[PDB]
Amino acid sequence: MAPERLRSRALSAFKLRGLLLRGEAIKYLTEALQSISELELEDKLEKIINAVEKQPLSSNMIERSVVEAAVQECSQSVDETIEHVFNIIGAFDIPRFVYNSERKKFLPLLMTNHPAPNLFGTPRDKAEMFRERYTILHQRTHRHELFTPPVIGSHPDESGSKFQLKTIETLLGSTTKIGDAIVLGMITQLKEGKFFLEDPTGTVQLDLSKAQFHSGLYTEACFVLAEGWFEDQVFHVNAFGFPPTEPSSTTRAYYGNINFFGGPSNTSVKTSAKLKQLEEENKDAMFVFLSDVWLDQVEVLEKLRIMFAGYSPAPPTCFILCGNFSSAPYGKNQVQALKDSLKTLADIICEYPDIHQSSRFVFVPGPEDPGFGSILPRPPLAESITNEFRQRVPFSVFTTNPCRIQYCTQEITVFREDLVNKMCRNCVRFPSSNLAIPNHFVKTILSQGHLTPLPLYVCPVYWAYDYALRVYPVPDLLVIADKYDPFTTTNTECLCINPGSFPRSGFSFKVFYPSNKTVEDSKLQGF
Amino acid sequence: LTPAELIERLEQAWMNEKFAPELLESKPEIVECVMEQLEHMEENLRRAKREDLKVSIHQMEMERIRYVLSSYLRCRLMKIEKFFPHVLEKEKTRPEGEPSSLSPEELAFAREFMANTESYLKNVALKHMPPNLQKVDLFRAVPKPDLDSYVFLRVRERQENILVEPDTDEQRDYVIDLEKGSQHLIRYKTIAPLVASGAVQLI
Amino acid sequence: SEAYFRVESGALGPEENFLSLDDILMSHEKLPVRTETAMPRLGAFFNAVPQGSKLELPLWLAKGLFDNKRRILSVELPKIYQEGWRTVFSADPNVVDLHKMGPHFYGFGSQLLHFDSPENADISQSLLQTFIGRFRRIMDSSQNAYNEDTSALVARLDEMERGLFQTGQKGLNDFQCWEKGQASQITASNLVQN
Amino acid sequence: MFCEKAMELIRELHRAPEGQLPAFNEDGLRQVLEEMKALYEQNQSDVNEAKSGGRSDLIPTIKFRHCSLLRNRRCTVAYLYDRLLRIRALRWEYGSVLPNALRFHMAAEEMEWFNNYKRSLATYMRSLGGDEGLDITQDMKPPKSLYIEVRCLKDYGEFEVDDGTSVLLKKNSQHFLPRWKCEQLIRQGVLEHIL
Amino acid sequence: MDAAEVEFLAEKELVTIIPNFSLDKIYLIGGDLGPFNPGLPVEVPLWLAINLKQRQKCRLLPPEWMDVEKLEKMRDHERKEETFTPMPSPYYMELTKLLLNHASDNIPKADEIRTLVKDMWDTRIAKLRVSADSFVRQQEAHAKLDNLTLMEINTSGTFLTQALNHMYKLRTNLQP
Amino acid sequence: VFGRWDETKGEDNIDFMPTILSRFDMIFIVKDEHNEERDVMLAKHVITLHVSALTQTQAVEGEIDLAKLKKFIAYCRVKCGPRLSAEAAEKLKNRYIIMRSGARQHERDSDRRSSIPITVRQLEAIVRIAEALSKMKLQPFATEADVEEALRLFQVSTLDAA
Structure with a gap:
């Protein structure tokens, strides 16, 4: 096709839609469209212009990167993707929304006067934690059926459904x-x-x-x-x-599909047709969850070898190994022992290359693991410990504790802490035994809408990052990794599970299938 | 039709569409002829050399002509967006052979605009309404053009016995003769056929 | 050019424009009525509202309830449209404060004719003569108050007359910008504030 | 009286005659829709009571709530339509890609309507000629000169003039360029026309 | 319609220039012009005349009516008459602005010409004010404005037409 | 009364009657508290101010000229008259009850009437302070934040009456 007419028509096609291309952008566009004629050229131009306008454009002027992404999307290249399909989000990466009462809307911090969160918070921020917890629970509470009747909703007045x-x-x-x-x-x-x-x-x-x-x-x-x-x-x-708990359907029906969970998506991932399809592209889309994986023990390493043998058929998309990785977390000794642990784990993973190339491996370290363990959100395990595993197993991500995992349209929260014991020791009124303690705990967590519904000295938190611990709206999975008891529960379209502690569960652990949201027991106790 | 008179008719339509309250009858021949004239002249100047005075003068005339055409089409699109259900109903009701108020492109734009607006209102509020009230007709909601608006005009073909109707009292009515070149201030509803036939120029 | 324009007010016509914000605000203004038959369940608002009750309620609601047989309620004029205030207007229309006497004086008065009062003709003639009397001052003030505080001039005008005043001011400012050559410059829109 | 919450939507829009777009009043819209729902439920209860029981005195209050419902509908529809008018003016007064500070004020469905309107407008503009159409969004004022001198207000990237020729729009740099190329950037405020 | 648009129409009027360059006949869409011979008068549209004067390519000659004696006679006739008199040009105000602002050096006695044109403008706008007031006071149904120019109509016509729309609806609201 | 404010003597430092003290919306007891850091910075400011009597009377960033501030005050005064929002009025109501209870209990504990009273005039003082804050911004209504700033200012003026 004639380059001069192709350039003129491409520039005109973008100009009529009100978009300006830089020189690099138009040059790249003409190179990409050189193989196309009038039977397809104008439809191609309209399609890629729509792809451009779908992106978060900050101005009418277009750099080469935007048209690159647009035409690549037009050329697909997203087949069998992992991006848009599986994300691990660190706690520090979660967006900082703030509820504005006069607007009755959640605003991102860039649209507000709120400062960025940092570890060395102001005296105000320490109060701001609990003030915002009250704010979220307050706006949750007043939207329940307890609200006042409408204009002559009942002929006698009523006290907000009593x-x-x-x-x-x-x-x-x-x-x-x-x-x-x-x-x-x-x-x-x-x-x-x-x-x-x-x-x-x-x-x-x-x-x-x-x-x-x-x-x-x-x-x-x-x-x-x-x-x-x-x-x-x-x-x-x-x-x-x-306060009564909401489902995420209710919350997003009220406030719209805001991506409270975080990640690349601008909207809530639970509402997306393309992502609904990509979730079910694999019928046995599957994940594995473990905790307290004491790889400083030869027994744990050998049993992990057997688990990889057992899951060589139908391997997961990713293995999730929650923290307290050590029998003996006691300093330099364990820094070197975790280096040895990850070297041996890389040896084992290379002894199963099919699982190496089929599955990812992510790590959520505990409070006792080396580093800044004792204050939340914990940073990842120390990079000097991870370095050999970074280069030898690129298919892996060490991350914060807690961390937010997204698989397509579903929301998974992973958090390592022995919190049931903390909660029951800080109990004000010893509960009735007719309901089981994990159900009590999950109901308390969901209703309080927070991973740490305890005083600050009980759950040390960097003050400005307390929002990252917030459970709001209710996700698909609450993976609360805790020594207390492995369990599975559910409420408000969430399955709240504990993989237990792998040395104390008799080396039992959990399996999850987001394609149907089912959960199975890896009951591999004699393995 | 020589091109000078084509540009003159374009400017006449431009003024009439500026000052008429309703959307006037379309001039697809004028639009197409001016467009092909602009394309032809731009091609000729593309063949010509730069740093040349006649090229710059031709470019300036092209700028003026394109400004008139763009402003005229913008005003027509303003009227279409303002009265989209009424112009669409008029096109539905139009007898065969009667000139259309819309070009095919303008008709497609009007249909797309009405569908977009109706779908917006539906999705935002009108599906949330009570079941009986979910439907509202934009033919009633959107106001009609005000044909009783007063306009200045200048006549180009002499007219006689044009009825001037002051108000609802019929017996106050009288008649006037519009002499060639005279200028008048009068309601548009009394002179709609005249401006449609080109007997008068709105100013 | 393609600037934003509000849906025009149709208050002076036989029926007001549906989508006009000005007409909506105008019709919100309250209107005295006498109820002709008792209405159950509405005692919470003014359990039944008894027959013969005097009420002041919005003009849209009065028009909705009003049928020409006068079955539900009888509609009475506001004081500013009765004979004494019509005489006040007849004295000198320029001195009455139509901003304080209902900001949509002409629109409310025109829609007040819908109820078929026996003095509809008097109301219509009063509105017409008030506009005729106030026109010259509106014209001169709008077309000659160049580049100054227009608050005192625009204070006593109703919203229709305020629209006319702004039209005249816009014409004056356009011609002055032309005469001083400032109209030739291409400039960013008002949205550069953002 | 019932209607006052709907009137706040109307008063919000009427208090800004300049045409700028306020933030979408989602909470007010929710409240007036809830009020309409409650009114309709009461009206249905009362009307079926009256018709089944043969009780005739309900009919005035039935008409009362019916008119109140129609009022609520008129107010919210007028609010939405006037917001559409303000949004439609943005494509001509500023351009296609709205700034994020303004885009934050719009509803998602408003952005849907705006994108549909932009696609329809671009389709209409393309269809005006044999090739490349006519960009009627340009030439908003009558032309005075073929070239103009422009000054860069924003520190900005490379701007193509024609093919291999381009100008760097660094702040306070001053160029002499064609008017039709500079019109959009002047209207967007990137450039200042001088003289 | 804006005053800039009325100026755009006024710029179509023909004026005479003396080029200092050589150029053969140029075939414009609105009508061929030229040939442009150095030192000889040639008639061109006003936009091209102003553009060439700005680019230092010609000397503008005043129109035949830009003469102090003729303009004084026209001014005195306008002040003497009650109706709008026929003006020398249909865009005389815009012609005066453009030609005197861009070519005061070429046009002799430009101060007198500008002041006389301003006198005529003031007189005729006063007449238009009187006509509008008489229209509204007498409740006329139409008016006759034969010799008004487009700029004069455009200056005050939007207000007048809106006011008369309001007056018409006020006097016709008893239609049944 | 004793030249400097003498904290040992308490309410004896004020000779004004309660009736005239009640009419003041805000009462500052601006004590001059000695501190080396404040004194150093204040002295540097004073000396630079005395040096700056020669430098052409230049303006300063983030500041309104005196004439412009005067005209802006006149414009806001004639144009805008605010009111309280409903929830803001509710907040002010509750805080007024708490404040009055505190004043009563302090007077009971001292077994002596305080020099500075807390009355309905002080409530209306908070109201009009919030309205002034709104009038600065030309807003038709005073928000909960405007009432909060009014309460903060009156709390400074009420610590000065403790």
């Missing part, structure tokens, strides 16, 4: 011995035995002589609906309860 809400500052006043007060607030043992409630407006004593408590494991720093009456600067509790 669940009308108030804050602490409102009842510090004329409302003495009002028998129907309900307040959202944080439980605190602000004096020993003399518990208090707190919200962003103020504080008040809790007379919890009767608790009448709904199922859930109550601790200090838990936010609760305290139902009771007020007298003598004391809130006399009639009942305690958590």
